[PDB]
Amino acid sequence: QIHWGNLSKIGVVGIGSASYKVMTRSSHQSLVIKLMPNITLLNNCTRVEIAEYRRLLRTVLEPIRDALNAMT
């Protein structure tokens, strides 16, 4: 029951209004991202291209794995 009429005569105004929600215990889920898709051919025409993609993955994934081991 804030009296906004009297309270504005002393320079106080209300510039917002909202409900209140407090955070309780959090839930958890595990998501597995497989970065290497399942390829069925694996011929001699794709050996070099698969290795080039694997080298891209090692550039990204290896610093993550090496940092997890060091910090834990």
Partner: protein
């Protein structure tokens, strides 16, 4: 006699034709080698070269598929890969994790649509990489989902103050930045762990603690119980901007409407002056120019244009006219030979 000359000339004429045929026979040998040389070229430097072209293109097709898959992963799980300790998840990753739709996200998490707006804007959902397998190239991502409890009846109010004049003296009222009400009850509010939003404040920790009886009287109407501050030797603020409305203390100073050029006069009966964004878009208060209206800039469009080219068109070889010509003449010699035998 006469027949001897005739036979000798016939013998000489026949002898020449024997040399004539043998020359044709050696010409036939050249054709076979030429045709064989054409066939050898096709099997030695065309078929192997085209198979290498086909093999190279198959590898290029897979490499483009692989790169497009990574760009999809970088598009969705980008911040998690760069920040394995704590990163916010994307809206695409949240949709995939809980079913395949936001409706399944809302029901599984118990959100209300406006709860998700306050969680997405406050960045409450965080992902942490807990396992990386470089042998088989996958990462395990652990996602934490906030749970929200609403205290029914509690409303959080934001208070913004401005100086005011009593004659020739300037005062200032000290009030908390935030207060909370539950029906007729008033309490204090701590905004340290909260995010003020129109739909509702989401606080990670408790924010409500009681209010003293003296401050309750101030907020309930008894403004003489509030703590004032005479502005002598100091200064405060003389205007507030509140979503397109300007609340200013234009007393004892010069306020003018920069757009129309008029002077905004503070009538002594009223304490504060209220200026709307429509009556005056730009206002000067105490020499300070305030933009009350909202400027809009012309729309911009980001687009691309791609121009391609039709593939090569290799037509029919069409060399059958010469082959058919030789076929017809070979047929003539086949018939003509039998006729000569009948004479003989």
């Amino acid at each position: 006699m006469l027949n001897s000359q005739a036979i000798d000339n016939l013998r000489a004429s026949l002898e020449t034709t024997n040399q004539a045929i043998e020359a044709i026979r050696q010409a036939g040998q050249g054709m076979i080698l030429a045709v064989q040389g054409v066939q050898d070229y096709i099997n030695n430097e065309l078929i192997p070269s085209m198979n290498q072209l086909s093999c190279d293109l198959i590898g290029q097709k897979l490499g483009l598929k692989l790169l497009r898959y990574y760009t999809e992963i970088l598009s969705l799980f980008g911040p998690s890969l760069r920040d394995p300790i704590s990163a916010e998840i994307s809206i695409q990753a949240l949709s995939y994790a809980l079913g395949g739709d936001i409706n399944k996200v809302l029901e599984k998490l118990g959100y209300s649509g406006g709860d998700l707006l306050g969680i997405l804007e406050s960045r409450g959902i965080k992902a942490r990489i807990t396992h990386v397998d470089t042998e088989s190239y996958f990462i395990v991502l652990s996602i934490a989902y906030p749970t929200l409890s609403e205290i029914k009846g509690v409303i959080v109010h934001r208070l913004e103050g401005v100086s005011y004049n009593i004659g020739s003296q300037e005062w200032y009222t000290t009030v908390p930045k935030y207060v909370a009400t539950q029906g007729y009850l008033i309490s204090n509010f701590d905004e340290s762990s909260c995010t003020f939003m129109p739909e509702g404040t989401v606080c990670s920790q408790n924010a409500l603690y009681p209010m003293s009886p003296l401050l309750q009287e101030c907020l309930r109407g008894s403004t003489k119980s509030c703590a004032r501050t005479l502005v002598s030797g100091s200064f405060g603020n003389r205007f507030i901007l509140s979503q397109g409305n300007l609340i200013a203390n234009c007393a004892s100073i010069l306020c003018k409407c920069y757009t129309t050029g008029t002077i905004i006069n503070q009538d002594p009966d009223k304490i504060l002056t209220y200026i709307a964004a429509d009556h005056c878009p730009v206002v000067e208060v105490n020499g300070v120019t305030i933009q009350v209206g909202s400027r809009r800039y012309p729309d911009a469009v980001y687009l691309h244009r791609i121009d391609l080219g039709p593939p090569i068109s290799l037509g029919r070889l069409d060399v059958g006219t010469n082959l058919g010509n030789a076929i017809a003449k070979l047929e003539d010699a086949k018939e003509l030979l039998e006729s000569s035998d009948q004479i003989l």
